[PDB]
Amino acid sequence: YEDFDTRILEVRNVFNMTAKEGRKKSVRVLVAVGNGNGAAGFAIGKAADRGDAFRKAKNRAIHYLHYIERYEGHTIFHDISLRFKRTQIRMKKQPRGYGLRCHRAIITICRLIGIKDMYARVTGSMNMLNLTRGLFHGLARQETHQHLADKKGLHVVEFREECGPLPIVVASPHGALSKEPEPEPEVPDTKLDWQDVKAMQGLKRSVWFNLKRPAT
Amino acid sequence: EVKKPAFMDEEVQRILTKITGLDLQKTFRPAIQPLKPPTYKLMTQAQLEEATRLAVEAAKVRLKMPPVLEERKPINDVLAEDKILEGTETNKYVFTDISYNIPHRERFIVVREPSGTLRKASWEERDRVIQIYFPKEGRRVLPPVIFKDENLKTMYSQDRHADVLNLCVAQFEPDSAEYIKVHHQTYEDIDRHGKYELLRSTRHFGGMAWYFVNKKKIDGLLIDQIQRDLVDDATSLVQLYHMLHPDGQSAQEAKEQAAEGVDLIKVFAKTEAQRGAYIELALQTYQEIVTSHS
């Protein structure tokens, strides 16, 4: 597995009660693994020695490899919002060159997955396990453009502002192309996040927002 | 007298548009600029074809050719000669009327010289001050340095002719000598190196063919159009050459033989082609390939 890299995410050194020494020692280590090409996984390893916990977590994670779909190899296929227990994650698909503007743990995992450009915000509890589980839960349940074309039978067309009105066909239905236009409501019933909308409403952001940071 | 065809003549614009061509991928090639996340729409085959039609409508407006004009004539008019003010000033005054609703070519920009002469501002002085008070995005007050022959040659080595011309349209006026100089230098470089494909599906192809027709050097463009299987374009180019040069030996020969289609190109080769021998060879080879394969 020379093509895979391992990264640590949390290391807890806790003392437990057992008759050997009265209070025994234990190290719980959460790690992540990935080849930077879509395959990644995480595991928890426990031992009395930190070295043993590293080995147990590292080899367990290679058995739980998710495959994450990347749009054009650099970003997620669509915005993703989810709550795993009390940890809320809100990811956004971004254009090339945007970089990884995310929680430091999400940057670590995204490099292992191979995502190069994305935005994410984490709210609620910052529990590392819930953030890792919640991240993989959302990234592994995302809908590729080809899947959407097959489900609805219609063409999936892309419109970039740097390409003008040129329609770009990114996915065509595998079977029979439909002829019923997808219903276009006059006013959508989408549930909007105040945090996303607040910006476009002209409300001042925090002094901490969009600061100059090193390349991620 | 039969009017000499113009660049904007509806007949000339038709022929120049056809030979130029269209390519939605080249016309709408991605710009290297600040980016935004793409949008996505689910569309049927009818909706997609409608969207492609709008893209072709926009590509037409994008390919609108820039004006081809003759070189402006120097402005040398003296409004007054007040000699009482001789020696009372060391520097020229330049006065610009900045009333908003006046066309820039109808504004009064005068110069009071140290000698006392009140004269109209020259063309170079007019363009500089109009940029200072009515600044145009893309244009700079002082002429950029990229237009120097050494710098332009660098852009040609990188095959950036469409850029040299897009910059020449942002900076200089169509009737200025600098505008004509750069265009005629770019068009001449394309000819020598046979780089006609660089300006296809661009707004600059028409002016290039126009320049070659007027200068009686369409040989290279015909040889290249034939080798690319664009023989309908080559025929249209020979029609435009027989339209701007009606009394030419080639135009009179085509009337005598009522030549059409591929015949027109053969007539040009024998009569007025600078390199007729090659036009026939390429034309013959095209016919052989078309006939042999199909």
State the CB neighbour count (10 A cutoff) for residue B110: 17
CA distance A91 to A107: 12
First to last CA, chain B: 47
CA distance B37 to B169: 31
CA distance B84 to B81: 9
Q: What are phi and psi of B49, to 5 degrees?
A: -65, -35
The shortest CB-CB distance from A95 to any of B25, B36, B41 is to B36
A38 close to A70: Cβ distance less than 8 angstroms: yes
CA distance A35 to B219: 57
How remote is the C-alpha of B131 from its chain's centroid? 23
B94 min Cα distance to partner chain A (Å): 42
Q: What are phi and psi of A34, to 5 degrees?
A: -170, 155
| Resolution (Å) of this entry | 3.1
Ramachandran class of B18: left when φ > 0, alpha when ψ lies in -120 to 50, beta otherwise: alpha
The shortest CB-CB distance from A97 to any of B30, B35, B52 is to B35
A138 min Cα distance to partner chain B (Å): 20
The verdict on B56 touching A (C-beta cutoff 8 Å) is: no
State the CB neighbour count (10 A cutoff) for residue B172: 21
CA distance B199 to B220: 14
Name the strand (E) or helix (H) holding B235: helix B231-244
CA distance B241 to B218: 8
Tracing tokens 């095209």 back to the chain, one arrives at: B286
The shortest CB-CB distance from B38 to any of A160, A180, A182 is to A160
A151 min Cα distance to partner chain B (Å): 11
A76 close to A93: Cβ distance less than 8 angstroms: yes
CA distance A82 to A89: 6
Instruction: Dump the DSSP string for chain A.
Output: -TT-EEEEEEEEEEEEEETTTEEEEEEEEEEEEE-SSSEEEEEEEEESSHHHHHHHHHHHHTTS-EE---BTTTB-SS-EEEEETTEEEEEEE--TT--EES-HHHHHHHHHHT--SEEEEEEE---HHHHHHHHHHHHTT---HHHHHHHH-SEEEEE-TTSTT--EEEE--SSPPP-SPPP--SS------HHHHHHHTT----TTTT------
Q: Is the dihedral of CA A148, A152, A157, A159 positive or negative?
A: negative
Give the chain A residue whose CA is nearest to the CA of B57: A165
CA distance A12 to B211: 77
With 0-12 / 13-18 / 19 or more C-beta atoms within 10 angstroms meaning exposed / middle / buried, residue B179 is buried
CA distance B245 to B252: 10
Reported residue count of chain A is: 216
* Structure letter (DSSP) for residue B204: T
A171 close to A148: Cβ distance less than 8 angstroms: yes
Q: List beta partners, residue A31.
A: A8, A43
CA distance A8 to A6: 7
CA distance A189 to A155: 23
With 0-12 / 13-18 / 19 or more C-beta atoms within 10 angstroms meaning exposed / middle / buried, residue A131 is buried
Give the chain B residue whose CA is nearest to the CA of A149: B42
* Structure letter (DSSP) for residue B162: H
Name the token pair of B83: 């000699």
Amino acid at A53: A
A197 Cβ contact partners less than 8 Å away, ≥ 6 residues apart: none
CA distance B117 to B174: 30
For an interface test with B, give the residue of A162, A180, A200 to mutate (most B CBs within 10 A).
Answer: A162
* Structure letter (DSSP) for residue B67: P
The shortest CB-CB distance from A154 to any of B30, B38, B44 is to B44
A162 Cβ contact partners less than 8 Å away, ≥ 6 residues apart: B30, B31, B33, B35
Measured between beta carbons, the chain B residues lying within 8 angstroms of A180 are 44
